[PDB]
Design a protein around this ligand. Structure first.
Ligand code: VO4
Ligand SMILES: [Mg+2]
Length: 239
């Protein structure tokens, strides 16, 4: 009845993806406004891209995603500004956005110290959705793979969260039973729903911003604001 494995989301759970991604946007705005003499049109372009990205995370992706997310910019520039297509400016914007966010994707020192002290009591797995190319780059950017007994990327797999199969696979990977695992993540629709679907021992929601969820949304077993609260939490579930 003791916890034998803990699964961890990556984005906005272990690394500040959102903060990093907006930092990239800020640089793109800084670029367009200063260099290419833009005003408030730049901020509109970034919003269009941001919503374009959301309507593309559909699974199972195809590659090259680079060509896709780059096209997301040229489609965005033309809508706000206008004129002929500018693949060069789109290429610049994307890689500036990409290079910026990846450098800000790092594991905090106290987060590293938490993961290190935790894997000597339970096994650790990294369970993240997204395409192979994009996610693996993040993994390398924050060098987290060294901290986990296993890493599983949804794009590389048959199904992602919240589908229970990918959870069952993680369990087989570590030779454990779903009832011995706890899922930790910050998205209800994937991390939490998935944990409930796959009958895991517990689900832990990361809610630092203090969202009050709808009654119809998945209900976690636990709710905390930081991943630093797990050791005490996991010790209370008895491990
Ligand atoms: O690391 V994720 O929040 O895209 O499952
Ligand atoms: Mg997340």
């Amino acid at each position: 009845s003791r916890v034998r494995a803990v699964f961890f989301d990556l984005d906005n759970t272990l690394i500040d993806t959102a903060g990093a991604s907006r930092r990239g946007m800020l640089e793109v705005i800084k670029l367009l406004q200063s260099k290419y003499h833009y005003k408030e049109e730049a901020e509109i372009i970034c919003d269009k891209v941001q919503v374009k990205l959301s309507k593309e995370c559909f699974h199972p992706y195809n590659t090259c995603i680079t060509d896709l997310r780059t096209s997301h910019w040229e489609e965005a520039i033309q809508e706000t500004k206008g004129g002929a297509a500018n693949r060069k400016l789109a290429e610049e914007c994307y890689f500036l956005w990409k290079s910026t966010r990846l450098q800000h994707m790092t594991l905090a020192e106290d987060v590293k110290a938490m993961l290190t002290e935790l894997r000597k009591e339970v096994r650790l797995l990294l369970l993240t959705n997204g395409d192979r190319q994009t996610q693996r780059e993040k993994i390398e950017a924050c060098a987290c793979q060294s901290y986990f007994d296993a890493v599983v990327v949804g794009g590389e797999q048959r199904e992602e969260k919240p589908a229970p199969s990918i959870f069952y696979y993680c369990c087989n990977l570590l030779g454990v039973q779903p009832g011995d695992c706890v899922m930790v993540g910050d998205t209800l629709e994937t991390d939490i729903q998935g944990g409930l679907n796959a009958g895991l021992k517990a689900t832990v929601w990361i809610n630092k911003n203090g969202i009050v969820p709808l009654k119809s949304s998945p209900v976690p077993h636990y709710m905390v604001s930081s991943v630093l609260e797990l050791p005490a939490l996991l010790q209370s579930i008895d491990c």
